Design a protein around this ligand. Structure first.
Ligand SMILES: CC(C)=CC[C@@H](O)C1=CC(=O)c2c(O)ccc(O)c2C1=O
Lengths: 273, 296
């Protein structure tokens, strides 16, 4: 199994450079609007320098929405794809197109951690890089990168500029809470191991949701929701392994050890695809 | 430090769908040539002992359905170069990036754009294993998916996917149709040689661990190159060569840690384990970053 990112092509043709005075970051150019972190003003249209490759764009209007600055420009972006702005929940996955001063640098697959950070790894100038999912040619933009937290992880907003997690776009000491493990994603990945070839970790035992959660929380694992059980029901059908018996494999796996560590960045949806 | 794949847009614009009778693969449309694996001209039978020159002489331009999205391409010429089919078409590809073909060596990295039936599905980052295989993650019909690097908007194509080995790994060719490793595009009992860790990549990754925060794995010792190899090959690590030592020289300079000291560090790590500790962001020693990657 390899984590894969979505192909980044449709998002690549939307990335511009946005410069206000001494500060430069990335922006997202959809139709005639460029989206970027409001941090770029730390005004009337003329002091916003927006470049899409070799051209310069003329800002003809500006507007804030929460922590995102909306820059209206003279031209619509002819490379605009079909797109939605969505907000994801911890444990869901998405791809990030890291950019430096407008130029897409690389792409990687993420999970929104349960403490609302992403273990990204970032170029010096990746502010305003976006995260997205693609379904049948529709880009779901779900993340705009703002900050690195002192602990090496990253914090950002949705494309309506609402922060994920208890962070502000001021230079206050802020720290991630204790990150947990995305339990429902480990289970999907253990299903994917049996749906492939691996079934040594299976056992004849089951467990209850309550007795599993007490075991789980001590190894810093997210509690498991009766909805979490439901979502993994397709995979229980495909393999013949009930969710609470895969939990017994997981409970035992949490005490004996034996990739060689348990992956938590594949959603159940990811595994079905 | 997240492994990143290259932005895939320049290769997305080149993927097509190649069909021959009942066989559909991915092809690579550059200027007015579509490249794809010659296996596309095989049938039901054929797979065990195909005679590709025989099957190809029997083919006309109009037996090849080449589709780019919703547009069918007219093939106006065909030709085999090693294990790759090359179809000449009507139209140059308008989206053709600046490109070149290169052949890579074990231990070098690249991105793979995995496609089905001509549509890109995902991109991942990759190392060519020492035994000349790939640990890919391939959907059903990813064959003809290509691998590549991008440097200053120039696309170097270096891999084309052909087959999945009985052990779960993947074999392919360069874009001139010469296989990497001792494999043939043939359904016979062929096995990957024993895979080993890319030692020069772990040491580069260890230097990247020092340039960032961590020094917890360092130690007082040093080692000779020969003594290092005798220990490491007992863990299925690739022998380090003078070339590899020379290649690590730059990172040695930036850290003031000598190459053979870093080697002594790695010896101890292989002896001890992590003790549930973490180096960059991994409980595993990571061997798919090259010395070239680490600098950038
Ligand atoms: C190589 C092996 C031990 C078994 C499969 C072999 O028959 C085969 C070779 C091949 O080259 C190929 C492609 O190139 C593309 C698709 C595809 O299924 C195939 C194949 O199955």
């Amino acid at each position: 199994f390899r984590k894969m990112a979505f192909p980044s092509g449709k998002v690549e043709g939307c990335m511009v450079q946005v410069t206000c005075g001494t500060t430069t970051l990335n922006g997202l150019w959809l139709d005639d609007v460029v989206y970027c972190p409001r941090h770029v003003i730390c005004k009337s249209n003329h002091n916003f320098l927006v470049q899409a490759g070799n051209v310069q764009l003329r800002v003809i209007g500006h507007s804030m929405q929460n922590c995102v600055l909306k820059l209206k420009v003279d031209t619509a972006n002819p490379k605009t794809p079909k797109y939605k702005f969505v907000r994801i929940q911890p444990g869901q996955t998405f791809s990030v197109l890291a950019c430096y001063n407008g130029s897409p640098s690389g792409v990687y697959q993420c999970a929104m951690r349960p403490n609302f950070t992403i273990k990204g790894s970032f170029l010096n100038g990746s502010c305003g890089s976006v995260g997205f999912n693609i379904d049948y040619d529709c880009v779901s933009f779900c993340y705009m990168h703002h900050m690195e937290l002192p602990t090496g992880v990253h914090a950002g907003t949705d494309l309506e500029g609402n922060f994920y997690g208890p962070f502000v776009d001021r230079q206050t000491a802020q720290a991630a809470g204790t990150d947990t493990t995305i339990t429902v994603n480990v289970l999907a990945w253990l299903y994917a191991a049996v749906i492939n070839g691996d079934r040594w970790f299976l056992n004849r035992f089951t467990t209850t949701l309550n007795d599993f959660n007490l075991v789980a929380m001590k190894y810093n694992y997210e509690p498991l929701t009766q909805d979490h059980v439901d979502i993994l029901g397709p995979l229980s059908a495909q393999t013949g392994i009930a969710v609470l018996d895969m939990c017994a494999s997981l409970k035992e796996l949490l005490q004996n050890g034996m990739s060689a560590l348990l992956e938590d960045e594949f959603t159940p949806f990811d595994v079905v695809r």
